[PDB]
Write a protein that binds this DNA or RNA. Structure first.
Ligand SMILES: Cc1c(N2CC[C@@H]([C@H](C)N)C2)c(F)cc2c(=O)n(N)c(=O)n(C3CC3)c12
Ligand SMILES: Cc1c(N2CC[C@@H]([C@H](C)N)C2)c(F)cc2c(=O)n(N)c(=O)n(C3CC3)c12
Ligand SMILES: [Mg+2]
Ligand SMILES: [Mg+2]
Ligand SMILES: [Mg+2]
Ligand SMILES: [Mg+2]
Lengths: 482, 210, 482, 208
DNA sequence: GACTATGCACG
DNA sequence: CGTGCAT
DNA sequence: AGTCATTCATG
DNA sequence: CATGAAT
């Protein structure tokens, strides 16, 4: 039958569960890979399924279904919508999912349903997953308890800053804007050498946000405040041009708009200025954006104060808006309002753990092989005696004991020898083995040095970050003014 | 929207407020139609302790739960006219299940306290595990002696729904009972109110992130 | 940049392309396994993915996704609605998909969407796929050209008649009703022994349809007509009882309704009768159906003529309906209107095909091995000289070659011998290998006989057919009259 | 529901009839907005030979076509008061795509014949293969490959390049060569009576 | 396949 | 108002 | 997560 | 008018 419970006590218990959950496992990104859980499952799953940049696309529905069936136990709209954003290059500075077909526009029109589209991981997504298969990252059981999944990705580049996040939980929310990949890495590499670096210096590398939508960012002072506190209010203003027209008439032309603004609504909200004659001079508003270039033409009347019009629009529409940094993320399981330094340090910290784990893994693998190779080298000088010894044994286990006892092979060596296929007795070439052995010792050394010496490890961390920068680097898009 | 019981009886009749149209259908199928009604809640429910009373009386569910309990809302609330003896909240045993229970409770408290006060507002506990069924990790270890981990009502057949959670002679119920009217006000307002700071703090003070 | 086509010409190619596909590859079932393409894919896919009756249910969306991405190039709603129908035991006499959650009801209310439900194949579904891995059935490429898929399933039971089909293409449509499994099999067994059997005789075994919803089927003449030509109108009518209520009142009590009739719509339609007093004496219409019984109660007024009413309802509602047979199916790629005999005949022809295929496969395997085992038996007799020759060999290729040249091994025996792991040399027990040589020969004999003796084969077919029946048979649900 | 051209010009302007809201979007995004309008056909177009003219009128897809072309329907139809120089039907190169072409055409024949007879009705041919190929033949030339399953797997950049760009696109112009044989063919394949159809299919479709 | 309404935090 | 994961 | 329209044959 | 795979 029934159990009694207090309203005071129940509201506490329930909202506590929701609060906690929606905080650490839904809305806020992890401070290391910069992903929300659903974003991480998307990538991890598409990757496990070999749905990568170098292979053919793949019905979006197939992907969504596997995500839902193996890892993320929620609606498919949530999963597919997440996956679509990751493909929209006007939201991500560096898109993580490539998608064939109608995946929305800047006009905000609905993307084709997963029934219609195909997808695969972008090449750069590759790097967020690099070394996932080498025990570099803490895993966990999925809801089924049928499959382990990663709790954070290796992150070969610092994705939190490059692609940003956003961002509404319970008690906390988040807004972190996109950043230039090359800049972010430069900042990171500096701080690697200079742990105690201060914001003023980092800003010689990380000047500020780089929106994939371009435009002009204004507020060097508020940018520092944000990079320091996690909060700040900068200004974003549309890139414009003036074209002289026939009849002595001038025409305003917008070619970049502020991050997260609907080109289509803008244009309506602007022609509403014309229509309500809110400022004098507007002949016609015209979207002329096409598949290769955004372009809003504002045509003016015969004698119209074009600097008057242009100003009025900035002030009273979204041709100019204020972006608000609010950089919250999950650090050690808790939500932390954080600025550029907590972030980069956390990234570095993380990359340190991966590279250490990665190296421990690869070394162990290499020792094991070396051990075998050492055994094979002996076996060759005693090929026949060994064969005779196996012939003379009764079964597999008896064979290995005779191998151990008569020639001091180790269990692992004995097993290797005893499980060689007959044809091997034809490739009896010790030089090539000695070559492998050498190669191996050399490798084990390089790896041992990383594990044994912080500065050697940090040089790798740096070597690698540069490789990524060299490969994925692109020009700034947003210009900066103070 | 509503699925009425067959015979009108303010002494036995139950109102089942169920999370989502689909589980609402599963419930419509496994109910005992004589005294059990079913009112699906189609998505997250409006926060009545955050919104204008105007936008609250325009809300599809709120409107249709005031006008089928038939006691009216607010000051004009006459417990004596209510049409069911038991109001039962049936959500998944997931976190957004938790969230919805929250949202509904704050509605009953704010605009129908007599109901909550009278011991007429319950919460159904669906089973968490099937090996037979178990509700407590402890109950699980006992069954393991002689596993599907339910992720929601969505994966239960009506047969199963009934047997474990709708059958009066089989189901565990939670009876929401206001112990101290003062503490309960503060609790509801911190967690569900328009003011963020308090709540952020409450979370910091209470939720163990480990 | 511009080509001219005539109306008569375009209208022709288009409607032809479409008509054909809709006939061969959409609406009509294959006469052998009684499945439409979508359904076959649902089954094959789920089965390939180990999603079976003895294993835990998978999220419906995962299944649907894999079907879409792998085999079926169409909407996910089509695929899921198909899946959900195979799970509803008031549409299928023997259900092929087990589904957890809201998969609908007889009140025709909407099933939970694929994000909510989970599924596996039913145990009997297993038998439609039995031996699919033994090259028993034609495969073809999927759209992707990445995967082969079956064009028809093995069908260890005659699904077309057990489960029926409907049924709307271009130029043709279909209505085949469900039949009792034990009965269909009795007829098939008979026809195996008596190829030229006549309908009248067959109907001794297969008297008429057996609806999963039960009820009364009236019209032995028209049933016969349909089994002969594939067409026939029959009458289906609800199982009713008359309860005596207090006060000299009566209650009509409905407990089974006609196939394909929506219970809830019925109850409404009956009430519209009471409300309009189209006929006199209805007191109350009351659905009393619960999770484990169908029951509509029609309470009558004291002094109402209960036969008059019951007749009115049978006539002017769906409390009684006419079921029309219209048995079209796909035989040799073409649509074909067909009765009981070409159906059973085609099923049998098919099972023959399968059993031969299956038997060739198994025997091909036993041969390949029996052949290796001879080789090994000989090697043991000359172990020393063989190890010597591999030792002399220059590499695998040469070793195999030297083996063939010097001792007359076959390539296959060569490959076996040369890929033995060293620890095999410990074994010189030929006797065990001989017990295997024996069991293999014996096995091959029995197989070959099946291939080469028509009677021996058909007996197999019957044996298996009866096993199926013993295992899955259930009683009739629908009663027959004339 | 309609996405119109920017400027009115009944000598350049084009109405694209696209199968599905989704490919509707890709066309809206890839087009040249100055002279290309987009009307998404959302579902299977009503059969205008089988249905009552009552229903034909109350049909969304059908109204907005009459309204957008703005030339009146049936008897009161003036090619003169038109709105586009070309009307372009663009569907997946799949069977249901063909079916859709079939239904639109029977509408244009039965209720705007002038338009069809004046060669204003065309049919966009999306590529079948990915460079791009339309012919199992070109595919061979090219091999010295993604098999497209519908318009919905195409980026708006690609749509334009291959099938919306007047310069790069391959079109079909629908002509009425023998008014007599055309009415015969349309009424057979699309009419109320099934048997003539079945017969047609038996005689004309090669099941093999 | 579009549409419709919520929560949560924040200017 | 609108954002993005959730229902 | 329901709602909405259409095709195709059929009696 | 429904039926059930399709758009
Ligand atoms: C129900 C519901 C809605 N509505 C419309 C009315 C509204 C009222 C408040 N119940 C419910 C609604 F407007 C939108 C959705 C929705 O987008 N997605 N993706 C969904 O899954 N659901 C289902 C709830 C989960 C929706
Ligand atoms: C469009 C459309 C509809 N409607 C309703 C309005 C109607 C207009 C009149 N064509 C279109 C409609 F009512 C239902 C569906 C639908 O169920 N499934 N599964 C779909 O995929 N679609 C999309 C067409 C493919 C639907
Ligand atoms: Mg502004
Ligand atoms: Mg849930
Ligand atoms: Mg009748
Ligand atoms: Mg298509």
């Amino acid at each position: 039958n029934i159990q009694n419970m207090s309203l005071e006590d129940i509201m506490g218990e329930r909202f506590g569960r929701y609060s906690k959950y929606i905080i650490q496992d839904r809305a806020l990104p992890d401070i290391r890979d910069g992903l929300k859980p659903v974003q991480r499952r998307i990538l991890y799953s598409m990757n496990k399924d070999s749905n990568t940049f170098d292979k053919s696309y793949r019905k979006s529905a197939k992907s969504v279904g596997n995500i839902m069936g193996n890892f993320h136990p929620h609606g498919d709209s949530s999963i597919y919508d997440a996956m679509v954003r990751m493909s929209q290059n006007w939201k991500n500075r560096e898109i993580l999912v490539e998608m064939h077909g109608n995946n929305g526009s800047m006009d905000g029109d609905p993307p084709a349903a997963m029934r219609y589209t195909e997808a695969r991981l972008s090449e750069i997504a590759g790097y967020l997953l690099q070394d996932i298969e080498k025990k570099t990252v803490p895993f966990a059981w999925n809801f089924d308890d049928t499959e382990k999944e990663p709790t954070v990705l290796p992150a070969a580049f610092p994705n939190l800053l490059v692609n940003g996040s956003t961002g509404i939980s319970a008690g906390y929310a988040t807004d972190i804007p996109p950043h230039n990949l090359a800049e972010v890495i430069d900042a990171a590499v500096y701080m690697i050498d200079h742990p105690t670096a201060k914001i003023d210096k980092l800003m010689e590398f990380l000047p500020g946000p780089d929106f994939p939508t371009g435009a002009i960012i204004q507020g060097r002072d508020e940018i520092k405040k944000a990079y320091e506190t996690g909060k700040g209010r900068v200004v974003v203003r549309s890139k414009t041009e003036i074209e002289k027209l026939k009849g002595g008439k001038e025409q305003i032309v917008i070619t970049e708009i502020p991050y997260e603004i609907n080109k289509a609504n803008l244009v309506k909200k602007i022609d509403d200025v014309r229509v309500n004659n809110k400022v004098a001079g507007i002949a016609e508003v015209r979207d002329e954006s096409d598949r290769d270039g955004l372009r809003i033409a504002i045509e003016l009347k015969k004698d119209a104060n074009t600097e008057l019009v242009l100003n009025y629009l900035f002030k009273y529409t979204d041709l100019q808006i204020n972006y608000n940094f609010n950089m919250v993320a999950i650090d050690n399981f808790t939500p932390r309002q954080v600025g550029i330094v907590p972030i980069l340090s956390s990234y570095i910290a993380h990359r340190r753990e991966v590279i250490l784990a990665r190296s421990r893994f690869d070394k162990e693998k290499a020792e094991k092989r070396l051990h075998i190779v050492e055994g094979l080298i002996r076996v060759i000088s005693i090929l026949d005696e060994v064969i005779a010894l196996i012939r003379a044994s009764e079964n597999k286990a008896d064979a290995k004991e005779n191998l151990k006892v008569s020639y001091d092979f180790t269990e692992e060596q004995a097993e290797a020898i005893v499980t060689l296929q007959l044809y091997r007795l034809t490739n009896t070439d010790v030089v090539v083995l000695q070559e492998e052995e050498a190669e191996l010792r050399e490798k084990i050394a390089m790896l041992a040095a990383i594990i044994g010496d912080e500065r050697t490890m940090y040089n790798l961390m740096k070597k690698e970050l540069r490789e990524v920068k060299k490969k994925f680097a692109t020009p700034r898009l947003s210009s900066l003014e103070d | 929207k509503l699925t009425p019981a067959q015979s009108k009886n303010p002494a036995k009749n139950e109102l089942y407020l169920v999370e989502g149209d689909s589980a609402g259908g599963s419930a419509k199928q496994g109910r005992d139609r004589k005294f059990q009604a079913i009112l699906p809640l189609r998505g997250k429910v409006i926060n009545t302790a955050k919104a204008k009373m105007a936008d609250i009386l325009k809300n599809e569910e709120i409107n249709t739960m005031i006008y089928t309990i038939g006691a009216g809302v607010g000051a004009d609330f006459s417990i004596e006219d209510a049409n069911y003896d038991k109001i039962i909240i049936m959500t998944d045993a997931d976190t957004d299940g938790a969230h919805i229970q929250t949202l509904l409770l704050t509605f009953f408290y704010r605009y129908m306290r007599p109901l909550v006060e009278a011991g007429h507002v319950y919460i159904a506990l669906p089973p968490l595990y099937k090996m037979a069924y178990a509700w407590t990790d402890g109950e699980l270890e006992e069954l393991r002696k002689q596993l599907q981990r339910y992720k929601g009502l969505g994966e239960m057949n009506a047969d199963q729904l009934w047997e474990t959670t709708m059958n009066p002679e089989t189901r565990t119920l939670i009876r929401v009972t206001i112990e101290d009217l003062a503490r309960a006000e503060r609790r509801v307002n911190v967690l569900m109110g328009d003011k963020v700071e308090p709540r952020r703090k409450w979370i910091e003070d209470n939720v163990k992130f480990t």
